[PDB]
RNA sequence: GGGGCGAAAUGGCCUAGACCAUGCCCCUUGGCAAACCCAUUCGACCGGGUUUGGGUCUUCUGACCUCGUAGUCCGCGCUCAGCGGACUUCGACCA
């Protein structure tokens, strides 16, 4: 399991940041919609294309982070090693005399 | 030596791998549900505009 | 798995909701890790006996 | 696979490697049912922080019984079990000559006639 | 640095104690690497309210200051001491060394480093576009309110 | 035009399980339990056109 | 290691064991492409409280397509994907004579021409 | 070291590595005086993003004048320096048999009579 | 590589090329532990604007010492180290002559009985 | 509680500018993996407590098992084990 540390870190624990999209997501693009929801039809006319404008920019731009991502997740899968060897030994005495 | 016969290697695997699982199964929670409940109601749309 | 992320940059007109793109990164992140499984291979190299 | 030949005095037994795995290796005796019959466990393990070793040995042998010879209709069924479980907590860094001895000491126990006493007659050891 | 109490108690032959007080001063990693710049493109004319195209970068990193100290103490065991506290009481023959420490503490060094992510972003073309058409936008329509008291 | 870059933390202290000794007792004393510190800062670059 | 010879009547087909393990035995063909090949998966256990066991048996085969021959750039890449698995709950204390009888119905079964006019045709069991 | 022989037509010329290095190969006349002879640097690198590459390589050869044979004292003394650079920009995924085109008419171009005539009489090139 | 023969009178050590480069050549004696023993750094450039050159010989020995023949217990240890470097800045434009009778003078000179003394008894050179 | 922000949602100010109101962004850290103990149908039943968890020699400096991290020359050969191997460094209950 330790030969796998370093590529379980740039799996997942650079893959924070692919979590993190989601957290602006969450918090500006569908709380921040609160003004659509208490005007009047004469402004939905309008607040609907600001909306859809404004996020559309956002998802082009996030655009290029996910092809960095993407080509990051490749290069977890090189089949690249090294190699482990062991080593045993053992003795047998065989005679003896005094002197 | 050469030809070495068949090896009996034996390897445990189950390597700490599902310890990266409760990072995104506990962020999921926190953000993207909350998102998916938010978007269930008025999706909004798209125009040539 | 092959998907991981399907990426390739697309737009169109009537039938794209913008945030319908940002929860599917997400999901295909999550079912990418599910399929993921080591598999290791050993085999015999060079040896002697002394 | 893996064979092992027991002589009882008349005849020889063979048992077979069947559930080959490092935590646990399960030989199993090839007589006749293979239902109740020899089963030995090996396990071989660590402690602590990398200090000494960890080894279990465990044999089972149910006896069974069956009344198709006389009776019109009855399975062979298993009566009672006997678990015969051991415990070998050695260093590694120890004496081989020490090991040696101790290992002599356990065969000389074993193959006295105190213990087949305590096991037969059920009398406490003590002669 | 770091102020201890060793206070002994004798054996038998008195049982009493000696306090024995030293300091140790103690090693720490560096203090935080506060920042705080400002740069401005040289004045082109003095007239401000028109002005001329300029640029400003400002760059500031600050962390609060706060101390603290911990502490805590101990002893030698024996058979049956039923007084164990800082400095034991009794004496049945042999002697206890105890001890109480108490080391401060600076956490504006025991701060990891700054992450990489504390950099100028970057903006496209479309961008900036965008944010232009939606200024101007506000801005007609913030002039086109004012008329309404003609 | 303007670009900003903010940057918000916290801090907290957390003894370790006990102070075991090797045939000796020791015990804790007041620790800070409390908040700690603080980390801030913010970034900007305006460029004006007119 | 393993082979297996298997006949198809002008042809013989050679498959080579590859994950030798006691709880999952996984046999691959070989012929030219190792990848979307015939694979074979056994698994052999007990049950309940020692009473019958289990065996499972899954044989799959994905079919390969190739364009290099006239296309110039297509990795070989599967098409489709057949799953045939089994499943064999027989106990122990049976009948050698009574499992014989059952191999036999099951092997005149698979070659009876009904079962592979159901697998062709596509036609329900019934003549 | 690294030998060059260049054939002058009567008489051979040798010219040996002193600087043996990747991003700098320093090569050195041999046939006297060292200082005041013929060098030769040649550097390879890459370029932008790991696009195309980057040659460069310069001949340079300064005279010296002496005045030891009829003037009392007079240490070899430089005149002038010439430097003849290049610049070699060719990317990889490029066509061989384009590149030996190019490499031949770079050669025809050199052993024409124009380059020559441009070099001596300083006539601009145009025949 | 590159092997150089010293014969200290009765015999012969032998230093192998080890970091060859032409700013740094470091030469390194092989005859049994390599950390620790003789070592020669070599280097040689220019000066000013291309007038005379410069080179520099360091010549390095530390002393190891080794407990593991009593003590059971003890990596081998450097102990002090020595440093004997030079200094040549010799002119391009020179004389052959003059340069061959320096060269003998330094060699009468290293050969002589007065340096040998004031490296060994610590006397002040003055015979 | 300790901080952040005027950005970002709007309202005062509203060439411009810098501040204000609601108002919005985080911490209340978290995880150990093993071995043993109770009353009983005198164990099946969930829940709790204790001993260990990179480790020893003088775990004082400093080294001896192990690895992780880097930089440097590296072998295209010398050594009984051989081998692909050398030197210097920081860390080592886990996010």
Redesign the interface.
């Known amino acids: 399991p330790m030969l796998y540390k370093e590529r379980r870190e740039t799996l997942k624990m650079v893959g924070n940041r692919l979590g993190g999209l989601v957290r602006v997501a969450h918090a500006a693009q569908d709380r921040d919609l609160k003004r659509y929801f208490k005007a009047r039809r004469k402004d939905r006319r309008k607040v609907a294309e600001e909306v859809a404008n404004g996020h559309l920019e956002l998802i082009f731009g996030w655009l290029p982070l996910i092809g960095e991502l993407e080509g990051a997740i490749e290069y977890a899968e090189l089949p690249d090693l090294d190699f482990i060897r062991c080593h045993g030994l053992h003795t047998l005495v065989l005679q003896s005399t005094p002197w | 030596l050469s030809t070495l016969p068949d090896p009996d290697v034996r390897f445990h695997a189950d390597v700490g791998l599902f310890e990266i699982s409760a990072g995104i199964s506990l962020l999921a929670q926190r953000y993207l549900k909350p998102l998916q409940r938010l978007l269930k109601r008025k999706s909004f749309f798209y125009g040539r505009t | 798995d092959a998907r991981?992320?399907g990426?390739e940059?697309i737009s169109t007109?009537?039938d794209?909701?913008?945030?319908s793109?940002?929860?599917g990164?997400?999901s295909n992140?999550?079912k990418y890790?599910?399929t993921?499984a080591?598999l290791?291979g050993?085999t015999?190299?060079?040896?002697?006996?002394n | 696979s893996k064979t092992i030949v027991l002589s009882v005095g008349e005849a020889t037994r063979t048992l077979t490697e069947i559930q080959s795995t490092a935590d646990r290796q399960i030989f199993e005796e090839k007589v006749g049912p293979l239902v109740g019959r020899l089963r030995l466990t090996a396990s071989l393990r660590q402690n602590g922080a990398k200090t000494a070793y960890r080894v279990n040995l465990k044999l089972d042998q149910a006896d069974v019984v069956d009344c198709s010879t006389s009776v019109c209709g009855e399975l062979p069924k298993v009566r009672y079990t006997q678990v015969w479980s051991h415990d070998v907590t050695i260093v590694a860094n120890s004496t081989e000559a020490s090991r040696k001895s101790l290992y002599d000491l356990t065969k000389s126990l074993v193959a006295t006639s105190q213990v087949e006493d305590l096991v037969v007659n059920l009398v406490p050891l003590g002669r | 640095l770091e102020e201890h109490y060793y206070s002994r108690k004798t054996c038998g032959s008195g049982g009493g104690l000696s306090v024995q007080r030293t300091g140790y001063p103690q090693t720490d990693p560096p203090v935080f690497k506060a920042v705080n710049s400002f740069e401005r493109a040289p004045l082109i004319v003095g007239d401000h309210v028109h002005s001329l195209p300029y640029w400003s970068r400002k760059i500031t990193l600050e962390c609060t200051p706060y101390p603290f100290t911990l502490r805590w103490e101990g002893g030698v065991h024996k058979d049956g001491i039923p007084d164990k506290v800082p400095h034991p009481s009794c004496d049945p023959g042999s002697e206890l060394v105890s001890y109480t420490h108490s080391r401060e503490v600076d956490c504006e060094r025991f701060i990891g480093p700054v992450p990489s992510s504390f950099t100028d972003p970057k903006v496209t073309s479309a961008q900036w576009k965008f944010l232009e058409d939606m200024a101007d936008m506000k801005a007609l329509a913030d002039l086109n309110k004012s008329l309404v008291n003609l | 035009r303007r670009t900003t870059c903010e940057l918000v933390g916290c801090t907290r202290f957390y003894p370790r399980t006990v102070s075991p000794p090797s045939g000796w007792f020791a015990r804790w004393k007041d620790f800070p339990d409390g908040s700690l510190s603080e980390v801030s800062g913010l970034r900007r670059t305006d460029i004006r056109s007119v």
């Open positions: 991981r992320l990426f940059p007109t009537y794209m909701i913008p945030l793109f940002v929860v990164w997400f992140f999550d890790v599910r993921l080591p290791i050993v015999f190299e060079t040896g002697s006996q």
